[PDB]
Design a protein around this ligand. Sequence first.
Ligand SMILES: *C(=O)c1ccc(O[C@@H]2O[C@H](CO)[C@H](O)[C@H](O)[C@H]2O)cc1
Ligand SMILES: [Ca+2]
Length: 121
Amino acid sequence: AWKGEVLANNEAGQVTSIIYNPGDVITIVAAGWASYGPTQKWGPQGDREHPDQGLICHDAFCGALVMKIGNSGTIPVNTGLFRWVAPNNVQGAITLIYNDVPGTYGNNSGSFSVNIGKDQS
Ligand SMILES: *C(=O)c1ccc(O[C@@H]2O[C@H](CO)[C@H](O)[C@H](O)[C@H]2O)cc1
Ligand SMILES: [Ca+2]
């Protein structure tokens, strides 16, 4: 399993040790407070009131936790995933990323502590 932090200001994303393979079932639990600029802090679900103006993931609110599996598109993680299975032809290292607009990560603060584990299958 993997346990670590994902800094909101980390545009490249946090690479984990989790290699998602075909047929894998995974569980992710994320917690913490982070910001995409404002003094206020939000959770892994981001800011439900903030409009999407170029986010790396259009399927989640700004300030939410997302991930990539291999060289796939951004996938919503939010508070986490319970016994989750990836789409077909999706595989590779899991990279956790703070959902924000490309090139704006500079003024982000906080982070998310995240737990990733593979489930029995
Ligand atoms: C509108 O209510 C509003 C717009 C922007 C904002 O902060 C910026 O949000 C950007 C993402 O949309 C980007 O992350 C900037 O760096 C932030 O300063 C708050 C509220
Ligand atoms: Ca920002």
